[PDB]
Amino acid sequence: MNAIHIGPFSITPAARGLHYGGLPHHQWTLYYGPREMAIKTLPDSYTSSEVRDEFSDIIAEFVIDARHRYAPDVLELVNSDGDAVLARVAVSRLPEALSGCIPDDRFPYWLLTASRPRLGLPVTLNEYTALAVELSAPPLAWITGLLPGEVLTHDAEEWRPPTSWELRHVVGEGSFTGVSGAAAAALLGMSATNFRKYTAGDSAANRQKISFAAWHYLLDRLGVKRAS
Amino acid sequence: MNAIHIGPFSITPAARGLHYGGLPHHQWTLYYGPREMAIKTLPDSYTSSEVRDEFSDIIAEFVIDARHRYAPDVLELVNSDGDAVLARVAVSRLPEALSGCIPDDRFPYWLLTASRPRLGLPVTLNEYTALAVELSAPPLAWITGLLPGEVLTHDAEEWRPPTSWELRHVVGEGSFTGVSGAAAAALLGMSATNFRKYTAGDSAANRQKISFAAWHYLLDRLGVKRAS
Amino acid sequence: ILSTASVLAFERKLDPSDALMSAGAWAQRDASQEWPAVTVREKSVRGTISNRLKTKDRDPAKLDASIQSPNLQTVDVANLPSDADTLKVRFTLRVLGGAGTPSACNDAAYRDKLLQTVATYVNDQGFAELARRYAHNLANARFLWRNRVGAEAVEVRINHIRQGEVARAWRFDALAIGLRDFKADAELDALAELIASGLSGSGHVLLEVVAFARIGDGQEVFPSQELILDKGDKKGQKSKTLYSVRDAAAIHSQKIGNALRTIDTWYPDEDGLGPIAVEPYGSVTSQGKAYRQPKQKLDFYTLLDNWVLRDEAPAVEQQHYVIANLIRGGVFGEA
Amino acid sequence: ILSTASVLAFERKLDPSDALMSAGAWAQRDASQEWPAVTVREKSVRGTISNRLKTKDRDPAKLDASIQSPNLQTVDVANLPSDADTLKVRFTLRVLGGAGTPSACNDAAYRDKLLQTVATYVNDQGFAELARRYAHNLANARFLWRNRVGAEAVEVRINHIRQGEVARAWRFDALAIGLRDFKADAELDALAELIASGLSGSGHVLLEVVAFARIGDGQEVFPSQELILDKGDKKGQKSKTLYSVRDAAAIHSQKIGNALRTIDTWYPDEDGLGPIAVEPYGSVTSQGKAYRQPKQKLDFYTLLDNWVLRDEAPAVEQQHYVIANLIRGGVFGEA
Amino acid sequence: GKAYRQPKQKLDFYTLLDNWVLRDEAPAVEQQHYVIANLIRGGVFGEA
Numbered sequence A, B: 001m002n003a004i005h006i007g008p009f010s011i012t013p014a015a016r017g018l019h020y021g022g023l024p025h026h027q028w029t030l031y032y033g034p035r036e037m038a039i040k041t042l043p044d045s046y047t048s049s050e051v052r053d054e055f056s057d058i059i060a061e062f063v064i065d066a067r068h069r070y071a072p073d074v075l076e077l078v079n080s081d082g083d084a085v086l087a088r089v090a091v092s093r094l095p096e097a098l099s100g101c102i103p104d105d106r107f108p109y110w111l112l113t114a115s116r117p118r119l120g121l122p123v124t125l126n127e128y129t130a131l132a133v134e135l136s137a138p139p140l141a142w143i144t145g146l147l148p149g150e151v152l153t154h155d156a157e158e159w160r161p162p163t164s165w166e167l168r169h170v171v172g173e174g175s176f177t178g179v180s181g182a183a184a185a186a187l188l189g190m191s192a193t194n195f196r197k198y199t200a201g202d203s204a205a206n207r208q209k210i211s212f213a214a215w216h217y218l219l220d221r222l223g224v225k226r227a228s
Numbered sequence C, D: 001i002l003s004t005a006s007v008l009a010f011e012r013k014l015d016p017s018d019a020l021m022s023a024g025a026w027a028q029r030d031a032s033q034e035w036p037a038v039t040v041r042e043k044s045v046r047g048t049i050s051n052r053l054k055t056k057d058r059d060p061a062k063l064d065a066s067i068q069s070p071n072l073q074t075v076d077v078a079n080l081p082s083d084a085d086t087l088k089v090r091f092t093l094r095v096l097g098g099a100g101t102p103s104a105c106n107d108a109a110y111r112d113k114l115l116q117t118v119a120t121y122v123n124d125q126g127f128a129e130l131a132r133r134y135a136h137n138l139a140n141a142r143f144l145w146r147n148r149v150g151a152e153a154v155e156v157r158i159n160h161i162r163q164g165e166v167a168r169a170w171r172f173d174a175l176a177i178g179l180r181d182f183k184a185d186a187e188l189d190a191l192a193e194l195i196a197s198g199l200s201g202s203g204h205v206l207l208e209v210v211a212f213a214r215i216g217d218g219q220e221v222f223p224s225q226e227l228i229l230d231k232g233d234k235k236g237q238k239s240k241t242l243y244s245v246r247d248a249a250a251i252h253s254q255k256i257g258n259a260l261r262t263i264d265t266w267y268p269d270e271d272g273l274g275p276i277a278v279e280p281y282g283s284v285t286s287q288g289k290a291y292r293q294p295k296q297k298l299d300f301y302t303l304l305d306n307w308v309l310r311d312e313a314p315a316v317e318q319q320h321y322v323i324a325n326l327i328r329g330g331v332f333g334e335a
Numbered sequence E: 001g002k003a004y005r006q007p008k009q010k011l012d013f014y015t016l017l018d019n020w021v022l023r024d025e026a027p028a029v030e031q032q033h034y035v036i037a038n039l040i041r042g043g044v045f046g047e048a
Helices: A048-069 A125-135 A164-168 A181-188 A192-199 A212-221 B048-069 B125-135 B141-146 B164-168 B181-188 B192-199 B212-221 C060-068 C108-124 C129-139 C186-199 C253-260 C300-308 C316-328 D060-067 D108-124 D129-139 D186-200 D253-260 D300-308 D316-328 E013-021 E029-041
Strands: A004-006 A009-018 A025-032 A035-043 A074-078 A085-090 A110-113 A119-122 B004-006 B009-018 B025-032 B035-043 B073-078 B085-091 B110-113 B119-122 C008-010 C019-024 C040-047 C071-079 C086-095 C154-162 C165-173 C205-214 C330-332 D019-024 D041-047 D071-077 D086-095 D154-161 D166-173 D205-214 D262-264
Touching: A004 A048, A009 A035, A009 A048, A025 A048, A035 A048, A085 B125, A125 B085, A125 B125, A164 A192, A181 A192, A181 A212, A212 B212, B004 B048, B009 B048, B025 B048, B035 B048, B048 B141, B073 B125, B085 B125, B119 C060, B164 B192, B181 B192, B181 B212, C019 C253, C040 D253, C086 C186, C086 C253, C108 C300, C108 C316, C129 C154, C129 C165, C129 C186, C129 C253, C129 C316, C165 C186, C186 C205, C300 C316, C316 C330, D019 D253, D086 D186, D086 D253, D108 D300, D108 D316, D129 D154, D129 D186, D129 D253, D129 D262, D129 D316, D166 D186, D186 D205, D253 D262, D262 D316, D300 D316, E013 E029
Parallel strands: none
Antiparallel strands: A004 A009, A009 A025, A025 A035, A074 A085, A074 A110, A110 A119, B004 B009, B009 B025, B025 B035, B073 B085, B073 B110, B110 B119, C008 C330, C019 C086, C040 C071, C086 C205, C154 C165, C154 C205, D019 D086, D041 D071, D086 D205, D154 D166, D154 D205
């Protein structure tokens, strides 16, 4: 019938309509960006919502795949022996001072990495709080795996504005963050129509690009990047 | 001569000149906005650096009083004894689960306020890590005590854009953040002239109001508010 | 060309004294010369936070922490004794002439033109409306600022002191004479003529003005409030100190002069709000706005420049406002 | 857009005088005009360790060493004489009116809108529920804070002092009219209409309130407690200082005003405690917590901003709370 | 000059009150008599 825009996904049917059995049928394809996820055939008598919960299992499988693949690293605060884990923190970025080490009895608390090559640092509790404050991962940080490095840099010269697809990951509809367009407009402090010029693409009319500060504050409010 | 602008401070002379001693003199006035703090008689042979250094002691005293007047509250993580302060974290706001608390041996770690009727909760190291990630104050948080509440609020309808005075608190010259206009324009991703339009007031021509997301991301980047 | 003079300092006319307060009883106001004075005592206040929060302190635990550590202050308080219901407020007023003559000037041409302008003002309409309004503000106890908002009955006695003895005594019911309307009365007209003769330079006018207010038995009376240095701890902060001279609570003389100057009813805004103080750019600091804005052509300086430099004489009410600014004094002139 | 005024200071209505404490006997309260005042005397106290030890003073030797050095203090104490069991407390309350009008308001249009909001309140329901609850707090001796928790019988006499004389007398029982229930009574209703006429602006209301408490012969009466500068030696430490005005123990005026203010029952928490004082963010010092949090959207500022700016009028109980805060007064608005 | 009911022996007022209220460890009947008698005598119990 026409493509259904759910999240960054587009359910695009084929223009040609075949007749499987005694009913008209169409090739509906799920696109994540430019890549096809699934190919299957659905009747034209089916509603668009029926196509939606037909593709919902593959959509949720890709959601769990993107959650697990870009899951943030976890540092463990352990005791002098190192076997018992007192605390676990989901980090955003690994530090630049930790190295390969074995916990000793000279320091009571040690920070280590979740992986088998345990690289870490012996820190006290206040330094542990300082590190957890400056390097915590926001709850929806895995979407930063799906976004390129140019749209996530804090330097404006290396910063590239997001496209319609990259913005359309996390603004409205069944997004990965789950928020709506009006909610994302109210987070940025402006009305719904001015954000609707940001969301809608196609021609250059009503295609103002979001600024660097507004994009990073929106990422802060959605808990995707910089939200410690 | 002319006024000396040190952040929100304005050193403006009286237009009348006196002749204290034999040498000519001028009565120089130091304002923090509408409030004057020091009126001092200084020679006309003084350079701008000497006029700045005459009021620098009162400027530093007011800065120290503002740091000690709008300092964020401190949460202390203590053991079961409740005396040895294991950790200290400066928080922008306290947890809502805080009530009047004395530590016991029922829980190994406790969180308390630094106030004399201490408010706290029995916490674990993961929950204390989560609370410290959520609620920690940025380092230059005391400047939020020198800003009005309507420029720090997160709702769109109850927010007024800051003036040139409240912008000059944090952005340029002798601002309390210590950054210049070029650095604060680099943090916001805008041009030097575009941000100089924001900083300079006077007439409405070549003077625009900063947006919600840009002002909030600037306060996030400068370490003044919403920077865990 | 008659350029504007640089310094235009004017001496204040209608000089008041520091209005001392004492305590006593109604119907003993005749023998009120031996009344004991109101003393400024100190008392302790403990309070919770009641002002608006900055939205950082809208955290419930911040509010409970503020309650659990409430603010402690010491306040200077002025109260009547429990056997005294009447507050007696006494001052003296010196009405002086030579209102148009500046104390300092930088141009003989400007001084001559200003003296000529005030002279033709007095010849066409002297200090009659201004002294009527000043006699009104003496009649109602507007110098009892918060000592009249709850007062049951206020009486004002004004004695004309000539050679150390009384020449004429005026007794006024200060509640019947309102703070809004400038009506006419025979005693008010006699006091207006006396203040007119004082302002014209045709005589010496010294008045003893005594106000008796029924604040109530043991009630809080309100003197003028002083500077707060804040050089101690936050517990013994001494958040409020009141004005006293020698163990006797008193009101500042500039407050009495401000109350006497509240005659301006000709600002460009609506005059149904009430009279305000004659002062340049017509300000009241409680309402925070300035009536007679400089952009409008009705503030004191633009009206003075039109009246003197280019001889555009304003309306008679606005010229009364200009002459009342000249009477009240001030450091006029640019810099 | 009709924003809130930055300066919204309000004067307090229902101004209480300082509550003088005297000493006397029961059934002589009809002639208690000569009773000797309660004098703040001094007594010495020796104390051992009775506070929680911070795990380092809990050693037997350190604790016994702390016992062998007792903390000697001198405390200001207020006791009745051994032939006196009744404590008399006398204060005057002045009801002003004009609670809608702020003392200071930056925004005219906001002042007009707030005046129209208070006017539409009074046109809907006048100062009748608030005056009834304030009259209930007059009738019970809630101003006798700790001189009622163990009192056998408390009696309150309220006189309407119009022209320095009793215009109307009321006698009550402060124990029958509890601190929990706002019931209805004919004399309580008459006092409610008197406070209503005071608060609306119909007339001037001054009330002389006398309280008698059956504490006990020679028992300790509890005045308001002052603030200690803590400068002297640790032997004569002066840990506690009571409030006196002229060699005569007394309660602070704002304590009496807070106890009369204790009418707020419409806070979102349960009625297990009872009425609290009408504060912004409903603060209670003894409980250490704030009823009417800003998070639960029932504080004074959110209710007033909904009522005035965007015409979202709350329930009549919250309207009573808002008007009771306006009667209470404060420095509202952004500093 | 000697303290019976030392906090080492856990027979003081504060340990017994905390065990009674928080952990619901009701002490011996004479000891809860002592605890309620301490509440009768009053105090500035809590953090000091």
